[PDB]
Every structure is written in structure tokens, then in C-alpha cells.
Amino acid sequence: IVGGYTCEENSLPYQVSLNSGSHFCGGSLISEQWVVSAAHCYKTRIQVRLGEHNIKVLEGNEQFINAAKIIRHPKYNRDTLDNDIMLIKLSSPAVINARVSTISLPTAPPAAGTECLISGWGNTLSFGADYPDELKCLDAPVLTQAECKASYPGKITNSMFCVGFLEGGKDSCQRDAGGPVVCNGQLQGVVSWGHGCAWKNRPGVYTKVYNYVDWIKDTIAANS
Amino acid sequence: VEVCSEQAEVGPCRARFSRWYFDVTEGKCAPFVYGGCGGNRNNFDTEEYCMAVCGS
């Protein structure tokens, strides 16, 4: 998160991180045994941590669970980043409480202009790198999917939409990918890609989760 | 066939993968942050695969 601010402890009980040695992506706890992330965060072997706030200063209340299945969207395309979404099934169901909890699936597509919360432990600078330890937050509006394809000509697909500021200075960054964007209390997108971090006229591109509530639901029933 | 002189590229996506690129000007491989998607072929999983393909 560039230009954002530090979240208060507990205020995102759904924000989850993916690990194999180090923190490489974020995630969203959507059901006791399921997490939603981006498909370019795929790794054969992932350990999902939950309830985290300071990544390198833990307290007793976090939860470490190894992924027991990692399913990427059948129509994921590595070059164009089409259908950049993926799910993770946790080997043990999460204990849901005041610091680990689920997020509702989106009941409608993201309205352009709507304010959303985007989070994750991603890089704080646009020039250079500074990966923070305390979870960061950013308040940003959905933008019209006409300015989104103006920013990135010929590279938007039916799965993507833009959030952020066209001026620049505020965005998600490397390590935020797969993390949540939550609008009016439900999960509207997964951070995916962007040319740079918070550059002028290049806002973050995110994955339209609403287009996947059917597939996400069949996948949980064919692996239960 | 000669990508070892290409820059280390993070790419458009936004993971943090630890990868390796061959640094042409110090004659060894070094690490860089890779988004997970896009980039160039001067990008390898281990410091050893990197040296085996472009070492001196």
C-alpha cells in the first residue's frame, strides 16, 4: 500500500497472507476453510497465516494453516492476466473470533465511483522498496471502466476494473497482490497488476470477483 | 539467447517472489523482486541456475 495508512489491529479480520518461507501475497478468508487470492500467486506449497497484524512481531493469537489445495481459475492466462483469481482450501478450518473472520461474497458488480478499502503488507514506496511490517490500508474509489481502459489501452478484459487515483501517489504494490478490496462490506476485487506503483495515470488493476461467485461456489462443492 | 544482459524486471503483477538475475556489471547474479507475471528471461529460481546459464 503506497500513500495509505496503518490499519488498526483487528479491523480487517479477513485479511490473510500467503507464505512459502516469506510473505509473497495477500488473501481473503471467505469461508471457514476457503481463501480467495490472485492466480499469479500460485505456488505448489503455500502456508496461509490469519489474524496477522505485525508480520515480524507476533502475539499468541495468529493462526498458521498450510494450504491443502490450490485451485487456479481454468481460464487464467499468464500473458494477458485474464481471470486472475484463485482459491485456497485450508488443511484445518479457521477458528473464527474477534481477530479472524470471513467476508461476504459480492452480491452486485462494483459501481463506478464507489469507495473501497484495499489492504495488504505491500511495498510503501513508488521509487525503491520499503516493505512494512504493520498492515496498511487505503481508501480509494472505483473508477469508470472507460478510464480504466484509457489508462491501459487494449489490455482490459471482462474480468478487470480499476481502483485508485489517476493523479497517482496512492495504490497497492508488490506483495499486496491477491489481497482484498472491500466495498460496502463485501469483497469486490482481488488486487492483480499495474504499471508501476501509484504512478500518474496508472492505477491498480483488480479482478472482478462478482464475475466468479458461480465458479467459486461450484469449486467449494466439488472439493468438500 | 543472450537475455543475461537484460534488466531485472518486476513486471505488472504485484506478488513478491524472490528471484535471481545476472548482474552484467559485477559479473555475478543478484536477487530482485519479481511480481509473478511478465518480465524478461533474465529471471531464475536459484542463484545456481542463474550462474549456470550466464556465469563467466
B48: Cβ–Cβ under 8 A, 6 or more apart, which residues?
none
Contact at 8 Å (CB) between A93 and A163? Answer: no
Question: Strands A136-141, A47-50: parallel, antiparallel or unpaired by DSSP?
Answer: unpaired
- In a shared domain, residues A81 and A146: no
For residue A217 the three cell numbers come to 461456489
C-alpha A193/C-alpha A76 separation (Å) is: 14
A80 with A108, same domain: the answer is: no
Based on the structure, what is the number of domains in chain A? 2
For chain B, the three-class secondary structure string (H helix, E strand, C coil) is: CCHHHCCCCCCCECCCEEEEEEECCCCEEEEEEECCCCCCCCCECCHHHHHHHHCC
Q: CB-based contact (8 Å) between B30 and chain A? A: no
The residue range of the domain holding B53 is 1-56
Alpha-carbon distance A119 to A12, whole Å?
8
Instruction: Answer yes or no: do A205 and A111 share one domain.
Output: yes
Domain count, chain B: 1
Contact (CB<8Å) B15/A178:
yes
Q: Do B17 and A129 touch (CB under 8 A)?
A: no
**Are A91 and A200 found together in one domain?**
no
Q: Measured between CA atoms, how close is A197 to chain B, in angstroms?
A: 9
* A150 Cβ contact list (under 8 Å, min separation 6): none
Beta-carbon contacts of residue A217 (< 8 Å; ≥ 6 apart) = none
B12 to chain A, any CB pair closer than 8 A? The answer is yes
CB A211 within 8 A of CB A158: yes
Phi, psi of B4 (to 5 degrees): -60, -15
For Cα atoms A37, A217, A159, give the angle at the middle one, nearest 5 degrees.
Answer: 50
* Same domain for A88 and A130: no
Residue in the block written with cell 481471470: A83
Residues in contact with A163: Cβ distance below 8 Å, sequence separation at least 6, in sequence order? A116, A118, A140, A141, A142, A143, A181, A189, A203, A204, A206
Distance of alpha carbon A85 from the chain centroid: 9
Q: How far B52 CA sits from the closest chain A CA (Å)? A: 24
Cα distance between the two ends of chain B = 15
Query: What experimental approach yielded this model?
Result: X-ray
Show residues of chain A in contact with B36, CB under 8 Å.
Answer: 24, 40-41, 177
Query: Which CATH number is B2's domain given?
Result: 4.10.410.10
CA distance linking residue A37 with residue A69, whole number of Å:
13
Cβ contact (<8 Å) for A40 and B36?
Answer: yes
Measure Cα distances from B29 to A146, B39, B47 in Å.
42, 17, 6
Nine-digit cell at A67?
Answer: 494450504
Residue A180 and residue A139 share a domain: yes
Helices (H), A63-222: 147-151, 213-221
> Contact, B52 vs B34, CB < 8 A?
no
Distance of residue A192 Cα from the nearest chain B Cα, in angstroms:
6
CATH number at residue A48: 2.40.10.10
- Taken as a whole, chain A contains a residue count of 224
Residue with cell 473464527: A96
My answer on whether A203 and A181 are in the same domain is yes
- Work out the number of other CB atoms within 10 angstroms of the CB of residue A15: 26
Q: Report how far apart, in Å, the C-alpha atoms of B13 and of each of A12, A195, B23, B28, B55 are.
A: 23, 8, 22, 26, 28
Q: Are residues A3 and A112 in the same domain?
A: yes
Asked if residue A43 lies in contact with residue A27, where contact means CB atoms within 8 angstroms, the answer is no
How many CB atoms within 10 Å of residue A194? 27
Nearest-angstrom CA–CA distance, A123 and A99: 24
Those residues whose C-beta lies under 8 Å from the C-beta of residue A191, and which sit 6 or more positions away, are: A26, A38, A118, A120, A172, A176, A177, A178, A179, A180, A181, A204, A206, A207, B14
By residue range, what is the domain housing residue A94?
A: 13-102+211-223
